[PDB]
């Protein structure tokens, strides 16, 4: 199941993933805390995201 961004997010460290509201993301790791490793299906990039900025999609 993929996720969608509810807000834009600008990276705050190099290995974060920046994204835009509406962007579809694959959650790759969600067992390390509030920050999840995600892969953008729109841009192809991968990095950490704040889990409270995204929601389950279709």
């Amino acid at each position: 199941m993929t996720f969608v961004a509810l807000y834009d997010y600008e990276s705050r460290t190099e290995t974060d993933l920046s994204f835009k509201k509406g962007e579809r993301l694959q959650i790759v790791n969600n067992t390390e805390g509030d920050w999840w490793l995600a892969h953008s299906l729109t841009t192809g990039q991968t990095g950490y995201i704040p889990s409270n900025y995204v929601a389950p999609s279709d």
Binding site: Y7, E32, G33, W35, P50, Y53
Partner: peptide
């Protein structure tokens, strides 16, 4: 926008 959460526990 929502408050950002603290960074995850770093692994050693």
């Amino acid at each position: 926008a929502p408050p950002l959460p603290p960074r995850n526990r770093p692994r050693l």
